[PDB]
Write an enzyme that holds these catalytic residues in place. Structure first.
Site, PDB file in Angstrom:
ATOM      1  N   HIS A  72      26.769  85.115 120.005  1.00 26.59           N
ATOM      2  CA  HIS A  72      25.316  85.142 119.778  1.00 26.59           C
ATOM      3  C   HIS A  72      24.546  84.114 120.627  1.00 26.59           C
ATOM      4  O   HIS A  72      23.697  83.364 120.134  1.00 26.59           O
ATOM      5  CB  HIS A  72      24.975  85.025 118.296  1.00 26.59           C
ATOM      6  CG  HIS A  72      24.529  86.326 117.728  1.00 26.59           C
ATOM      7  ND1 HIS A  72      23.221  86.770 117.872  1.00 26.59           N
ATOM      8  CD2 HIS A  72      25.266  87.299 117.138  1.00 26.59           C
ATOM      9  CE1 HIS A  72      23.202  87.981 117.328  1.00 26.59           C
ATOM     10  NE2 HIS A  72      24.409  88.345 116.895  1.00 26.59           N
ATOM     11  N   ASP A 136      18.227  81.389 110.560  1.00 21.91           N
ATOM     12  CA  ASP A 136      17.561  82.622 110.125  1.00 21.91           C
ATOM     13  C   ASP A 136      18.547  83.794 110.046  1.00 21.91           C
ATOM     14  O   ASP A 136      18.314  84.694 109.268  1.00 21.91           O
ATOM     15  CB  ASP A 136      16.432  83.007 111.087  1.00 21.91           C
ATOM     16  CG  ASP A 136      15.288  82.020 111.220  1.00 21.91           C
ATOM     17  OD1 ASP A 136      15.083  81.208 110.285  1.00 21.91           O
ATOM     18  OD2 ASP A 136      14.583  82.077 112.243  1.00 21.91           O
ATOM     19  N   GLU A 250       8.288  78.372 107.690  1.00 25.08           N
ATOM     20  CA  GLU A 250       8.323  78.863 109.066  1.00 25.08           C
ATOM     21  C   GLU A 250       6.948  79.452 109.410  1.00 25.08           C
ATOM     22  O   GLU A 250       5.994  79.372 108.617  1.00 25.08           O
ATOM     23  CB  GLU A 250       9.471  79.872 109.318  1.00 25.08           C
ATOM     24  CG  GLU A 250      10.835  79.205 109.382  1.00 25.08           C
ATOM     25  CD  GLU A 250      11.988  79.954 110.020  1.00 25.08           C
ATOM     26  OE1 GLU A 250      13.123  79.442 109.905  1.00 25.08           O
ATOM     27  OE2 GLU A 250      11.778  81.033 110.623  1.00 25.08           O
TER      28      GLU A 250
HETATM   29  C1  LIG Z   1      22.019  86.069 118.270  1.00 25.11           C
HETATM   30  C2  LIG Z   1      21.227  85.156 117.367  1.00 25.11           C
HETATM   31  C3  LIG Z   1      21.329  83.774 117.528  1.00 25.11           C
HETATM   32  C4  LIG Z   1      20.596  82.892 116.726  1.00 25.11           C
HETATM   33  C5  LIG Z   1      19.749  83.414 115.727  1.00 25.11           C
HETATM   34  C6  LIG Z   1      19.634  84.798 115.584  1.00 25.11           C
HETATM   35  C7  LIG Z   1      20.360  85.675 116.379  1.00 25.11           C
HETATM   36  C8  LIG Z   1      20.155  87.160 116.201  1.00 25.11           C
HETATM   37  N1  LIG Z   1      19.050  82.598 114.846  1.00 25.11           N
HETATM   38  C9  LIG Z   1      19.197  81.302 114.960  1.00 25.11           C
HETATM   39  C10 LIG Z   1      18.505  80.447 114.008  1.00 25.11           C
HETATM   40  O1  LIG Z   1      17.730  80.826 113.135  1.00 25.11           O
HETATM   41  N2  LIG Z   1      18.733  79.094 114.187  1.00 25.11           N
HETATM   42  C11 LIG Z   1      19.536  78.530 115.165  1.00 25.11           C
HETATM   43  O2  LIG Z   1      19.714  77.311 115.134  1.00 25.11           O
HETATM   44  N3  LIG Z   1      20.170  79.337 116.081  1.00 25.11           N
HETATM   45  C12 LIG Z   1      20.020  80.656 115.975  1.00 25.11           C
HETATM   46  N4  LIG Z   1      20.694  81.475 116.845  1.00 25.11           N
HETATM   47  C13 LIG Z   1      21.509  80.872 117.923  1.00 25.11           C
HETATM   48  C14 LIG Z   1      22.919  80.430 117.536  1.00 25.11           C
HETATM   49  O3  LIG Z   1      22.862  79.396 116.552  1.00 25.11           O
HETATM   50  C15 LIG Z   1      23.687  79.830 118.715  1.00 25.11           C
HETATM   51  O4  LIG Z   1      23.547  80.681 119.851  1.00 25.11           O
HETATM   52  C16 LIG Z   1      25.130  79.394 118.433  1.00 25.11           C
HETATM   53  O5  LIG Z   1      25.863  79.259 119.646  1.00 25.11           O
HETATM   54  C17 LIG Z   1      25.883  80.212 117.399  1.00 25.11           C
HETATM   55  O6  LIG Z   1      26.462  81.409 117.938  1.00 25.11           O
HETATM   56  P1  LIG Z   1      28.084  81.805 117.821  1.00 25.11           P
HETATM   57  O7  LIG Z   1      28.975  81.570 116.662  1.00 25.11           O
HETATM   58  O8  LIG Z   1      28.014  83.302 118.044  1.00 25.11           O
HETATM   59  O9  LIG Z   1      28.738  81.176 119.134  1.00 25.11           O
HETATM   60  P2  LIG Z   1      28.922  81.753 120.612  1.00 25.11           P
HETATM   61  O10 LIG Z   1      27.730  82.518 121.026  1.00 25.11           O
HETATM   62  O11 LIG Z   1      30.141  82.644 120.609  1.00 25.11           O
HETATM   63  O12 LIG Z   1      29.161  80.427 121.463  1.00 25.11           O
HETATM   64  C18 LIG Z   1      28.036  79.609 121.872  1.00 25.11           C
HETATM   65  C19 LIG Z   1      28.526  78.364 122.576  1.00 25.11           C
HETATM   66  O13 LIG Z   1      29.192  77.497 121.630  1.00 25.11           O
HETATM   67  C20 LIG Z   1      30.560  77.355 121.973  1.00 25.11           C
HETATM   68  N5  LIG Z   1      31.348  77.400 120.745  1.00 25.11           N
HETATM   69  C21 LIG Z   1      31.536  78.463 119.899  1.00 25.11           C
HETATM   70  N6  LIG Z   1      32.263  78.185 118.844  1.00 25.11           N
HETATM   71  C22 LIG Z   1      32.593  76.847 119.015  1.00 25.11           C
HETATM   72  C23 LIG Z   1      33.381  75.956 118.255  1.00 25.11           C
HETATM   73  N7  LIG Z   1      34.044  76.304 117.142  1.00 25.11           N
HETATM   74  N8  LIG Z   1      33.508  74.686 118.710  1.00 25.11           N
HETATM   75  C24 LIG Z   1      32.902  74.346 119.853  1.00 25.11           C
HETATM   76  N9  LIG Z   1      32.151  75.102 120.661  1.00 25.11           N
HETATM   77  C25 LIG Z   1      32.029  76.350 120.181  1.00 25.11           C
HETATM   78  C26 LIG Z   1      30.873  78.457 122.991  1.00 25.11           C
HETATM   79  O14 LIG Z   1      31.998  78.190 123.823  1.00 25.11           O
HETATM   80  C27 LIG Z   1      29.528  78.578 123.711  1.00 25.11           C
HETATM   81  O15 LIG Z   1      29.361  77.585 124.715  1.00 25.11           O
HETATM   82  O1  LIG Z   2      16.514  84.571 115.689  1.00 22.95           O
HETATM   83  C1  LIG Z   2      15.837  83.883 114.924  1.00 22.95           C
HETATM   84  N1  LIG Z   2      15.103  84.398 113.883  1.00 22.95           N
HETATM   85  C2  LIG Z   2      14.797  85.757 113.621  1.00 22.95           C
HETATM   86  C3  LIG Z   2      14.074  86.092 112.478  1.00 22.95           C
HETATM   87  C4  LIG Z   2      13.730  87.416 112.269  1.00 22.95           C
HETATM   88 CL1  LIG Z   2      12.769  87.826 110.877  1.00 22.95          CL
HETATM   89  C5  LIG Z   2      14.079  88.416 113.156  1.00 22.95           C
HETATM   90  C6  LIG Z   2      14.766  88.057 114.306  1.00 22.95           C
HETATM   91  O2  LIG Z   2      14.905  88.984 115.370  1.00 22.95           O
HETATM   92  C7  LIG Z   2      15.974  89.780 115.401  1.00 22.95           C
HETATM   93  F1  LIG Z   2      15.969  90.491 116.520  1.00 22.95           F
HETATM   94  F2  LIG Z   2      15.970  90.637 114.392  1.00 22.95           F
HETATM   95  F3  LIG Z   2      17.116  89.104 115.351  1.00 22.95           F
HETATM   96  C8  LIG Z   2      15.155  86.746 114.534  1.00 22.95           C
HETATM   97  N2  LIG Z   2      15.656  82.530 115.073  1.00 22.95           N
HETATM   98  C9  LIG Z   2      16.115  81.701 116.137  1.00 22.95           C
HETATM   99  C10 LIG Z   2      16.781  82.237 117.246  1.00 22.95           C
HETATM  100  C11 LIG Z   2      17.333  81.395 118.199  1.00 22.95           C
HETATM  101  C12 LIG Z   2      17.221  80.026 118.063  1.00 22.95           C
HETATM  102  C13 LIG Z   2      16.535  79.486 116.986  1.00 22.95           C
HETATM  103  C14 LIG Z   2      15.963  80.307 116.015  1.00 22.95           C
HETATM  104  C15 LIG Z   2      15.242  79.674 114.838  1.00 22.95           C
HETATM  105  C16 LIG Z   2      13.739  79.863 114.898  1.00 22.95           C
HETATM  106  O3  LIG Z   2      13.230  80.050 113.584  1.00 22.95           O
END
Ligand SMILES: *Cc1cc2c(cc1C)nc1c(=O)[nH]c(=O)nc-1n2C[C@H](O)[C@H](O)[C@H](O)COP(=O)(O)OP(=O)(O)OC[C@H]1O[C@@H](n2cnc3c(N)ncnc32)[C@H](O)[C@@H]1O
Ligand SMILES: O=C(Nc1cc(Cl)cc(OC(F)(F)F)c1)Nc1ccccc1CCO
Length: 499
Positions: A72, A136, A250
């Site tokens: 993600h 989120d 938010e």
């Molecule tokens: C796709 C997405 C992302 C997202 C979000 C909503 C969506 C639809 N809402 C978020 C939110 O409300 N608040 C927030 O802080 N972030 C939000 N995101 C982003 C997400 O937190 C980050 O992108 C994060 O990386 C989590 O994603 P995930 O578990 O899928 O990890 P990845 O994409 O595969 O890897 C990202 C990077 O981190 C390194 N990695 C992964 N796992 C680990 C561990 N266990 N230890 C160390 N490093 C790790 C990867 O190698 C890469 O560099």
């Molecule tokens: O993805 C996030 N929220 C979010 C909330 C809703 Cl209602 C819909 C949505 O869109 C989609 F397409 F449905 F997933 C996404 N947040 C997010 C993303 C990256 C970094 C930090 C954040 C925190 C910012 O609040």
């Protein structure tokens, strides 16, 4: 590509080299970067990750190692071309979540770094407990979010997810398995938190817990003036000791065209709701609508008492009269709300599309200048798919000794804003326009002297990373040389060249 001796190890039974296996680790949620690894490692235990890292670190030809949570990320951060992607999910073979709630002791949850926040929630609720701060979207790994910060609507009160961790198990870039906390191996603990996987793989996190609520009174409040919207958001995050307040705060920026030309209904708004909102956004010409999104947690409270508590709170605010929108749901339904949005998007074929997303932390003193240049000038006639989030947070709940970056100000202002451009390209042909807007936002901040920090930063030059980490850069470079001397870990972050 990979060294021949890798296939002679005890861990070689966990190495998948077939085209269908490597294809699953070749792309991410961004759907713009395609870089297939040489293999996908499916470890049965954290000791398997230690063995793989140690082999690469002692090898004549060291190879990149990248853990993958749910993929993600959108800038190729989880990609390992010429190396090995670690499918963290395989660690979730058996029981990987342990809740410690023994009477006469502080409760906590030990969760594998691969574990999804939705599964942590399910396990803790069986004990009437839950973590305090949530992203989120719940289908993210513990390790993935903790390597960034993990921001959401409760962070103004309790800080980011990285401020709600007692300890970690980390597999360093030398293959060493280290348990770290504020009191033991604190340099690695501070480094890993918001550390972008640069110092090691998180295999366990001990997460802080609080008594779990049962239900949530969830509101969206409409504003037509950015100044009134921001004053109210700041008021809502600045009276934390008062019993009259939200547990979650938010906000959203909806551009005029996004309402007028948007859908007939959403999972939150009905057709009649959107009709009235379109009317509000065009009463004295075209304007954007700013929504405050608030959530009030409750346990055994009656419906009439919750009505009275919500009314006492809303009676203090300055939203457009007749424009509060309300839902009453379970705590799980509130936290897992984005799963319903995903379901709708997947049915429409609007989920598995490019996501050239941009996340910024903007100083509060420049938030109205940002609004003027970005929403009122650059994007006034834009109609991007996706959403734009905007809300403030409190610097006093973030530990600046951790790697994660927040905006620095001359007057030490406690308030900063998170502005999230979560725009999607319904067609891959829409990507250049969204990327041009991303670059225009950043160029505008540069010209105006608005010193932002990107959240989930992505730079392809060391000048970008030095500017991002600022005062912490020298300490970060020192910890990198110590914990990942061969720069094997998460090279898709593009912070450190291979030595
Ligand atoms: C796709 C997405 C992302 C997202 C979000 C909503 C969506 C639809 N809402 C978020 C939110 O409300 N608040 C927030 O802080 N972030 C939000 N995101 C982003 C997400 O937190 C980050 O992108 C994060 O990386 C989590 O994603 P995930 O578990 O899928 O990890 P990845 O994409 O595969 O890897 C990202 C990077 O981190 C390194 N990695 C992964 N796992 C680990 C561990 N266990 N230890 C160390 N490093 C790790 C990867 O190698 C890469 O560099
Ligand atoms: O993805 C996030 N929220 C979010 C909330 C809703 Cl209602 C819909 C949505 O869109 C989609 F397409 F449905 F997933 C996404 N947040 C997010 C993303 C990256 C970094 C930090 C954040 C925190 C910012 O609040």
């Amino acid at each position: 590509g990979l060294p021949g001796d890798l296939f002679g190890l005890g861990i070689a039974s966990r190495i998948r080299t077939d085209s269908n296996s490597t294809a699953k680790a070749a792309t991410d949620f961004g759907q713009m970067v395609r870089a297939a690894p040489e293999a996908v490692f499916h470890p049965a235990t954290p000791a398997d990750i230690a063995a793989l890292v140690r082999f690469s670190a002692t090898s004549a030809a060291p190879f990149p190692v990248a853990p993958r949570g749910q993929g993600h990320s959108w800038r190729g951060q989880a990609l390992a071309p010429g190396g090995v992607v670690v499918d963290m999910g395989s660690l979730g073979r058996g029981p990987r979540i342990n809740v410690s709630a023994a009477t006469g002791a502080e409760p906590f949850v030990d969760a594998g770094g691969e574990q999804l926040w939705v599964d942590v929630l399910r396990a803790t609720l069986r004990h009437g407990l839950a973590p305090r701060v949530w992203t989120d979207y719940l289908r993210l790994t513990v390790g993935g979010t903790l390597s960034n910060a993990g921001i959401g609507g409760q962070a103004f009160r309790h800080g980011p997810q990285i401020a709600n961790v007692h300890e970690l198990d980390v597999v360093t870039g030398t293959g060493e398995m280290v348990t770290c906390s504020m009191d033991v191996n604190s340099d690695l603990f501070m480094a890993a938190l918001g550390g972008l996987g640069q110092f090691g793989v998180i295999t366990r996190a001990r997460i802080r817990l609080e008594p779990a609520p049962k239900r949530v009174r969830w509101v969206r409040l409409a504003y037509t003036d950015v100044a009134t919207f921001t004053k109210d958001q700041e008021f809502l995050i600045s009276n934390r000791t008062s019993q009259v307040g939200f547990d979650y705060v938010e906000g959203q920026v909806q551009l005029n065209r996004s309402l007028v030309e948007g859908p007939k209904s959403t999972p939150f708004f009905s057709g009649a709701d959107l009709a009235r909102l379109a009317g509000l956004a065009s009463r004295t010409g075209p304007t954007a609508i700013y929504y405050i999104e608030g959530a009030m947690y409750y346990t055994e409270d009656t419906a009439i008492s919750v009505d009275k508590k919500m009314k006492a709170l809303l009676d203090q605010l300055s939203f457009e009269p007749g424009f509060p929108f309300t839902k009453d749901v379970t705590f799980v339904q509130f936290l897992d709300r984005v799963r319903e949005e995903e379901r709708v998007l997947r049915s429409a074929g609007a989920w598995e599309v490019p996501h050239p997303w941009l996340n910024l932390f903007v100083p509060r003193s420049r938030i109205l200048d940002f609004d003027d240049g970005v929403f009122k000038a650059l994007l006034k006639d834009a109609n991007p798919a996706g959403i734009i989030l905007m809300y403030p947070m409190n610097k006093d709940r973030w530990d600046d000794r951790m790697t994660a970056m927040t905006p620095a100000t001359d007057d030490d202002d406690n308030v900063f804003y998170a502005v999230s451009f979560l725009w999607s390209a319904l067609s891959a042909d829409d990507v250049p326009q969204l990327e041009r807007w991303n670059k225009a936002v950043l160029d505008f901040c540069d010209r105006s002297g608005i010193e932002c920090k990107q959240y989930l930063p992505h730079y392809t030059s060391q000048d970008g990373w030095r500017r991002h980490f600022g005062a912490k850069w020298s300490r970060i470079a020192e910890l990198k040389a110590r914990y990942d001397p061969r720069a094997l870990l998460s090279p898709g972050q593009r912070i450190f060249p291979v030595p």
